[PDB]
């Protein structure tokens, strides 16, 4: 299918206790492959997936220097932000960024992303056409104009449509044995009291990759959201994911229900009953 | 491959 590469960065200022802490992580689809932490001793970009271990010493220097530059860029962007919002030099603030690209199965560019957040709120974002910007407030509007006047979008689109795509494409080949692996959910069901009248049925999907999964409940072949609870998909820690879906049913009427599990790792969807 | 940061100034 199609694929993604994303980087997520987090700068947290701490006035009076040194420079902002900067953390960046890289992902390919659902698999994390690199990290940098400005508080950690190495001062290096580091591997977090086995397939990226193939990269030579110059790749690690190159990525190290680029992520440390981002570190510096966001250190300055925090100071600017403070002035824009006229905030005091006392408090901690957070500058977050996300960027990356998607490619189709052919390996061709599908979409690119380049966006900022300040204290948990959208700040500015590159629009889908990779040529224009969306500012979320008056402060961000200053930045938008700055970037439009300087035609900054072009350099960003160039990265997204080129370097980003070539990188993703490369990682996908180097790590095909895992990144292009499919891992089917292993399913089962639990059953719990709740009360005098009703029990809960929980449908489990375990050890599946990629995260993308659909779990739905049905009563007599008719689906139900009415008394349905669907938890966040969660990491198992071994590179695979877990998720469950639950319904509340009348006690003694459990066989009336079925759970349906769709996942691209499945020849055909699975159907479970208590 | 990390991007460069030219043009990223608020």
């Amino acid at each position, epitope marked *: 299918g199609s694929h993604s590469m994303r980087y997520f960065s987090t700068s947290v200022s701490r006035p009076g206790r040194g420079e902002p802490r900067f953390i960046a992580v890289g992902y390919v689809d659902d698999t994390q492959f690199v990290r940098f932490d400005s508080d950690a001793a190495s001062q290096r970009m580091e591997p977090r997936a086995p397939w990226i271990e193939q990269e030579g010493p110059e790749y690690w220097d190159e990525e190290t220097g680029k992520v440390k530059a981002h570190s510096q860029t966001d250190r300055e962007n925090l100071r600017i932000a403070l002035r824009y919002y006229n905030q005091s030099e006392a408090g901690s603030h957070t500058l977050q960024m996300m960027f990356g690209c998607d490619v189709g199965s052919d390996g061709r560019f599908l979409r690119g992303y380049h966006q900022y957040a300040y204290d948990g709120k959208d700040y500015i974002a590159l629009k889908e056409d990779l040529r224009s910007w969306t500012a979320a407030d008056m402060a961000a509007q200053i930045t938008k104009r700055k970037w439009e006047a300087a035609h900054v979008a072009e350099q960003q689109r*160039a990265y997204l449509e080129g370097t980003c795509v070539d990188g993703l494409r490369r990682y996908l080949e180097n790590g095909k044995e895992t990144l292009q692996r499919t891992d089917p959910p292993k399913t089962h069901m639990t059953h719990h009291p709740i009360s005098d009248h009703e029990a809960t049925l929980r449908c489990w999907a375990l050890g599946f990759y990629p995260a993308e999964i659909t779990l739905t409940w049905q009563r007599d072949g008719e689906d139900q959201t009415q008394d349905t609870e669907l938890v966040e998909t969660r990491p198992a820690g071994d590179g695979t994911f877990q998720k469950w879906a639950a319904v509340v049913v009348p006690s003694g009427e459990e066989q009336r229900y079925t759970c349906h599990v769709q996942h691209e790792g499945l020849p055909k969807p699975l159907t479970l009953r208590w | 491959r990390y991007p*460069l940061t030219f043009g990223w100034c608020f």
Partner: T-cell receptor
Amino acid sequence: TGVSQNPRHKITKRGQNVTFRCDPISEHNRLYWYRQTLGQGPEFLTYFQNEAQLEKSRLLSDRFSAERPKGSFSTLEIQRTEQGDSAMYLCASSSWDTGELFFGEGSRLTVLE
Amino acid sequence: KQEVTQIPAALSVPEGENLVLNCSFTDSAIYNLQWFRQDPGKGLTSLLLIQSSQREQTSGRLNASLDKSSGRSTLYIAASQPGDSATYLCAVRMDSSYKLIFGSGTRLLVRP
């Protein structure tokens, strides 16, 4: 207006220490150091973003150190100069958006025995 | 292992000639390219900058083109004047680094 380097000329004796200064273009984001010998291209020494020295040439001598303590102006120091140090030392700075490098006049070093 | 070569190393021409100054690089993962002029004993004057996205750039009698796939960049000088006499430096920035990487230059003489 542009990049300002001092001293423009320096003649020294082998074993002596020299210091070169660069005053980049106002609020230019990055400052770069280069070295150039006769009829050759500039070779990279080191660079700063603000006051962070983020990349230095792996061939850079132990005797060479740079700093840009406030951002703004930068300092390049050579300890115990050798005739091989003799070269044109070039300072440049780039803007936040373009990355276009603008160079100073250069600081021309001759180390005599 | 990026190698920037400049073609040719030196050039003597009659005034008014249309000139081709070539620059090639072995690695095409280029962020941008920059052209410089250098006059003996002096520093570098910035002439043209071409970004990865852009294909050409012009300033008066100067036109620079760029072909990333080819690994090639040409600087055209129209109507060469004796005043163009200088060393012309080609430099590239990698996608992977902030520094500029220089060629050795083309030494140009335009004869009056």
